[PDB]
Every structure is written in C-alpha cells, then in structure tokens.
C-alpha cells in the first residue's frame, strides 16, 4: 500500500525530473539492458513449442508476467532513489484530445516527442533522443536510435477509448479455453487486444510505432513501462470489481500458463503476483 503509482498528468515537474534521472542512471549502469533482454527472451519462449503462445504474450500469463516485470523494474528504480515509483500513462484520456500527440507526456522534459520523418522517424527531442540514448535490436546489437511515428498505421490510427476500457472491465471470466489469441469472452484477451484486433494494449503499441510497434525491441522506449503500468492498473481495477473470479487456467493449460507455474525467465508464478497490494504498491486511484 505504501508505494503509490501516479497518473503521469498529475506528477509535479520535480517528480518528472527525478523519474527521468533515475531511468538514465539505470541505463548508464547497464541495468536497463536486462529488462529489454528479458522481454525478447520471453517472447521467443513458446508454450508449448510450435505454438503461438509464449511466456509473456498471447496467453493467460500476459498480465502476471508484465506485473512481475514492472515490479522488478520499480524495485531497481527504488534502489537509486527511494522516492521514485512507476507512473502510468492513461492513454484512454489522451485519446479524448483533439491531437493526442499534444499530450503532456510527450514534452521535452519527459518522454520526448514524435519521430522526425526527415531522419527515418528517429526521435530527436527529450532526454531519450538519438545521441542521448542508445538502443538495441532483436539480436542484442546496437540499432542506433529510438524511433516513433504516432498514428501512422491504418490498423491503429487512434489510441483506445475510455469506452473500450470500461467494456473490457465488464467481462466476467479472467480467461477462457483454449487460452490463446482466439479466447472468447476473456478479460485477458480483450485487454491484450486481439478480438477484432488490434485493440487496447496491442493498439497502443501500433499507435506509437517505432520500437514500440515491434514487440521485441518495444522496451527500448521508456514509454513501454508507463503503458504497461496503465495496463497493470486496469487489471488491478478488474480484480477489485470481480473479487469472486480468480486467474485461469488453474490447471491443464500449457506449462508456463497455469496458476502455479513459473513464468520464464523467472521462477515467479502468477499466484505470486495476484495481489498487487501484497507487492508493496497501489495506484493513486484506489486512494
């Protein structure tokens, strides 16, 4: 309950500065790199081998995997500056703006802005601009710059709306067999955004573009973590509203997807992270 994860649009200027500084330190110490790599690894871990499902996406473990990923990230932040917690990007309200790219999240003192079409959509403003911030490709080799291209695709010209979020919150089952991209009446799948896709979490990736657009190499962009903090909150809100439901599958899903299975690359189980308050943190909205 102690750590409070705040909306980005509410943070003081000094708070935004301290978050950025701490991420920059993490990167400099080489700690940031481990999080980009953990993510690419998990996506190449299919469950079972040959299938679409992987340790971190396109199945039941999606939500607990990323909650565990963010928890560890935030712990590392905390090591550097005990007063720093993970904010969340409330994309569904930015969606309501005339030009969501005008959002305060994209200012030069925070995330930086959109990509420069003259330079192949290389980002050149903000603390993460090419030259200030090195990036890595899928193979682990330098790629030479953060890229972004807001709303450029025909699939995802807009962020998801407050209605999309409310509607996913109405779903009664946490997931359904066969626990994959085709799962119907499934909260995990709806939030993941496959149903008439891309929606919700997937749609946000496509909207940002650049490294965010490609699931390996999505965490090269600090914004990845604000997006996933917002996804963690929506999940947290759902758990509150449907206190009677629990994670599924409890058993008989593919190994790595069940309630008491280790989530590659770690030993942590979905059970280990089910109660977000027992992990030491809460979202401002609860309070």
Known binder of ligand: residue 227?
A: no
Taking CA atoms, 107 is separated from 15, 93, 95, 266, in Å, by 14, 17, 17, 35
Q: How far is the CB of 96 from Cu ion (least distance, A)?
A: 21
Q: Which is nearer to Cu ion, 59 or 258 (CB)?
A: 59
Cβ neighbors of 28 (< 8 A, separation 6 or more) are none
Q: Which is nearer to Cu ion, 41 or 285 (CB)?
A: 41
Q: How far is the CB of 81 from Cu ion (least distance, A)?
A: 25
Q: Which is nearer to Cu ion, 56 or 168 (CB)?
A: 56
Q: Which is nearer to Cu ion, 171 or 223 (CB)?
A: 223
User: How many residues contact Cu ion, by CB under 5 A?
Assistant: 1
Q: How far is the CB of 131 from Cu ion (least distance, A)?
A: 26
Structure tokens that stand for 107 in this block: 């200012």
Known binder of ligand: residue 46?
A: yes
Known binder of ligand: residue 271?
A: no
Q: How far is the CB of 43 from Cu ion (least distance, A)?
A: 7
Q: Which is nearer to Cu ion, 221 or 272 (CB)?
A: 221
x/- binding map, residues 40-79, to Cu ion, per CB under 5 A? ----------------x-----------------------
Which of 18, 6, 210 has the alpha carbon at shortest distance from 110?
18
Q: How far is the CB of 45 from Cu ion (least distance, A)?
A: 12
Q: Which is nearer to Cu ion, 34 or 132 (CB)?
A: 34
Q: How far is the CB of 244 from Cu ion (least distance, A)?
A: 28
Q: For binding to Cu ion (CB under 5 A), which residues are involved?
A: 56
Binding-site positions for Cu(2+): 39, 57, 66, 201, 205, 228
Binding-site positions: 10, 13, 39, 46, 52, 57, 66, 68, 92, 109, 120, 163, 201, 205, 228, 242, 276-277, 284
């Amino acid at each position: 309950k102690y750590r409070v994860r705040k909306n980005v649009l509410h943070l003081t200027d000094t708070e935004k500065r301290d978050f950025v500084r701490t991420v920059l330190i993490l990167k400099e110490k080489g700690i940031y790199d481990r999080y980009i790599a953990w993510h690419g690894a998990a996506g190449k871990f299919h469950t079972p081998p040959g299938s679409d499902r992987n340790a971190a996406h396109m199945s039941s473990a999606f939500l607990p995997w990323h909650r565990e990923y963010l928890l560890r990230f935030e712990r590392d932040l905390q090591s550097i500056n005990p007063e720093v917690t993970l904010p969340y990007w409330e994309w569904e309200t930015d969606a309501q703006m005339q030009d969501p790219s005008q959002s305060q999240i994209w200012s030069a003192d925070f995330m930086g802005g959109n990509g420069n079409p003259i330079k192949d959509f290389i980002v050149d403003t903000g603390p993460f601009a090419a030259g200030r911030w090195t990036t890595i490709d899928e193979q682990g080799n330098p790629s030479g710059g953060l890229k972004r291209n807001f709303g450029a695709t025909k699939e995802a010209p807009t962020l998801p709306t407050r209605d999309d979020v409310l509607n996913a919150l109405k779903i009664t089952q946490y997931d359904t067999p066969p626990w994959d991209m085709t799962s119907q009446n499934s909260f995990r799948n709806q939030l993941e955004g496959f149903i008439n896709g891309p929606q919700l979490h997937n749609r946000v990736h496509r909207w940002v573009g650049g490294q965010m657009g490609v699931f390996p190499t999505a965490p090269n962009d600090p914004v990845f973590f604000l997006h996933h903090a917002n996804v963690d909150r929506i999940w947290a809100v759902w758990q509150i509203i449907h206190r009677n439901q629990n994670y599924q599958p409890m058993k008989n899903g593919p190994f790595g997807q069940n309630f008491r299975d280790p989530m590659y690359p770690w030993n942590t189980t979905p059970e280990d992270v089910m109660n977000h308050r027992k992990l030491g943190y809460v979202y401002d909205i609860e309070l």
